[PDB]
Design a protein around this ligand. Sequence first.
Ligand code: NAG
Lengths: 48, 24, 32
Amino acid sequence: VKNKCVNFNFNGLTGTGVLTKSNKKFLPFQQFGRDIVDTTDAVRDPQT
Amino acid sequence: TTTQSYTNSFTRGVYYPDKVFRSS
Amino acid sequence: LNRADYYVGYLQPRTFLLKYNENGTITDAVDC
Ligand SMILES: *[C@@H]1O[C@H](CO)[C@@H](O)[C@H](O)[C@H]1NC(C)=O
């Protein structure tokens, strides 16, 4: 489910945040994504 | 058989330490 | 088997800095 404030637990990385579609360019060996200051940015869906 | 000549690697031999997307 | 290679290097803990392209690849690296 997307576009709502949902408690999320992707691959053991737990937290709270709204989720939606993204136009990232993930490489095949890539799972997570961070930014310049080391916080989880985008997660590839393991089942999607 | 083989030799043991020594050369320089130049700029070479770099892999991604992790699997985390980054840009700019 | 048959009827100019073998380049072997040795890595040590060294700090590196890698330029990540906007797509997510790496384009330049410098040794510290
Ligand atoms: C993994 O998630 C579901 C679990 O039932 C599976 O059917 C599907 O084929 C997988 N999805 C992808 C995109 O790998």
